Amino acid sequence: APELLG
Amino acid sequence: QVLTQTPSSVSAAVGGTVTINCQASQSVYNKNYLAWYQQKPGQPPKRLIYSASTLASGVSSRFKGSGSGTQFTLTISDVQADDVATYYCLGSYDQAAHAFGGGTKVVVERTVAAPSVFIFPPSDEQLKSGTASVVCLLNNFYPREAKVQWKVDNALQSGNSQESVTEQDSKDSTYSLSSTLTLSKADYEKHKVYACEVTHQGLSSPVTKSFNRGE
Amino acid sequence: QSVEESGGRLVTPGTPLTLTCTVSGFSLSSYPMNWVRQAPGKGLEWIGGIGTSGNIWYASWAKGRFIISRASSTTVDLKVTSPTTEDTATYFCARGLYNDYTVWGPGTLVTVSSASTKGPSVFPLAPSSKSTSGGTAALGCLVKDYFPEPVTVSWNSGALTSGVHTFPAVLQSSGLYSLSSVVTVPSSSLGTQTYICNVNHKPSNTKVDKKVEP
């Protein structure tokens, strides 16, 4: 965390 | 993330150019994590640009993205009548949590046009159910601001009418409005004259369309 | 590659709702999945989303009100634990959100209301030979008292599209919706050409063909 979501 | 688009609405003639702004509270990820979306009424959002300036697959070159960090801009060259939509920016600070801006409405400009007014009596089939809806249509006008006043035997009606305006037309860039005056069967058949006064810019005086009950 | 939402319906305030995102043509594990919503006439709002590993993120306001997870090998859910009227919105699911691999679903409409589903009544907005604005007659249909949204209206089984205006529905004081659809047509054809409006309200299974004549 965090990471790419888009 | 909180992204703010200002102003909320932008305008251009069929063929002009509009500038849509998007300010982030703080810098987005890698200074360029910002996308632009297009949403026409009813459709799901269409992604136009990502990476601040990068055009999406198949999107026209008329849409130009520019900016870095916190300030961004969507320029739309050669505005079509079809460009009537709300544009949203999409940003992220840490690439996980996203946020949309408020949106910017794109109004297509054109010459002023007075509305065509039409009045519709309630159907005898509705009157059987015990209600009377009297509709008044204002057709194909520009700009949007328009005013409708109902009168039943010269008595101003208030509180018992709802209206609805359509989005800006994709071809002629006009608006249309439908005003519905709702009465009970009891109140409807106790009066005779039902009028609809329309005030609008394109009009020199308020035009009235009306009818007589039972005629 | 495509996604689709499921579960959009009429829910009462406080009763738990679960929306589902089914995917096709790609692994659910390979791409990140997001949930976006949109209240009527309002802007788009990112609710949350799941990454490739499995971890989940939510917006600041959406913390607690929403729960996202994978419920299948091919599904991703969104549970709203205590729905309120503010949650009435079209909920979207999408593969990604930002990169070029992005694909959205059509969206599913959630209505949070304690009101019951109701079918519309279709009435004609009849024209006249003598109330015509310059060789141009206006006719239409009044689709009145239905719940919830939406209703679709075409003219002549989709063969009449020019000059047709379907107005946004208005929420009446009764809690029921009401809309009209109008069309401007040649005045000389009022006696020779037929004009039918096709009303379909799927929540109630109400399909109506209404002829409008002077």
Question: CA C178 to CA C145: how far, in whole Å?
Answer: 5
Beta-carbon contacts of residue C43 (< 8 Å; ≥ 6 apart): B86, B88, B100, B101, B102, B103
Bridge partners of C77? C20, C69
Beta-carbon count within 10 A of C160 CB: 16
> Is B164's Cβ below 8 Å from some Cβ in C?
yes
A:B CB pairs within 8 Å: 18
Q: A1–C50: do the CB atoms touch at under 8 Å? A: no
Q: Which residues of B touch A1 (CB under 8 A)?
A: 96
Resolution in A: 2.2
Q: Kindly state whether residues C152 and C194 are assigned to the same domain.
A: yes
Q: Kindly state whether residues B97 and B141 are assigned to the same domain.
A: no
Q: Count the domains in chain C.
A: 2
Question: CA C31 to CA C101: how far, in whole Å?
Answer: 9
- For residue C129 the two structure tokens come to 């030979």
Q: Kindly state whether residues C71 and C146 are assigned to the same domain.
A: no
Q: Which domain holds residue B134?
A: 111-213
- Give the three-class secondary structure for C193: coil
Question: CA B148 to CA C148: how far, in whole Å?
Answer: 28
According to DSSP, residue B142 is labeled B
Structural domain ending residue among the three candidates C57, C83, C114: C114
Amino acid of residue C86: E
Q: Which domain holds residue C34?
A: 2-114
Chain C: list its partners (3+ Cβ pairs within 8 Å): A, B
Instruction: Give the domain CATH number at C213.
Output: 2.60.40.10
Q: Count the domains in chain B.
A: 2
Q: Kindly state whether residues C100 and C123 are assigned to the same domain.
A: no
Nearest-Cα residue of chain B relative to residue A5: B96
How determined? Answer: X-ray
Give just the sign of the alpha carbon dihedral C160, C162, C168, C172. Answer: negative
Q: Which residues of C27-40 are buried (b: 16+ CB within 10 A; e: fewer)?
A: ebeebbbbbbbbee
DSSP class per residue in C126-158: ---TTS-SSS-EEEEEEEEEEBSS--EEEEGGG
Instruction: Give the domain CATH number at B186.
Output: 2.60.40.10
Q: Sheet containing B3-4: which strands, arranged edge to edge?
A: B3-4, B17-24, B71-77, B63-68
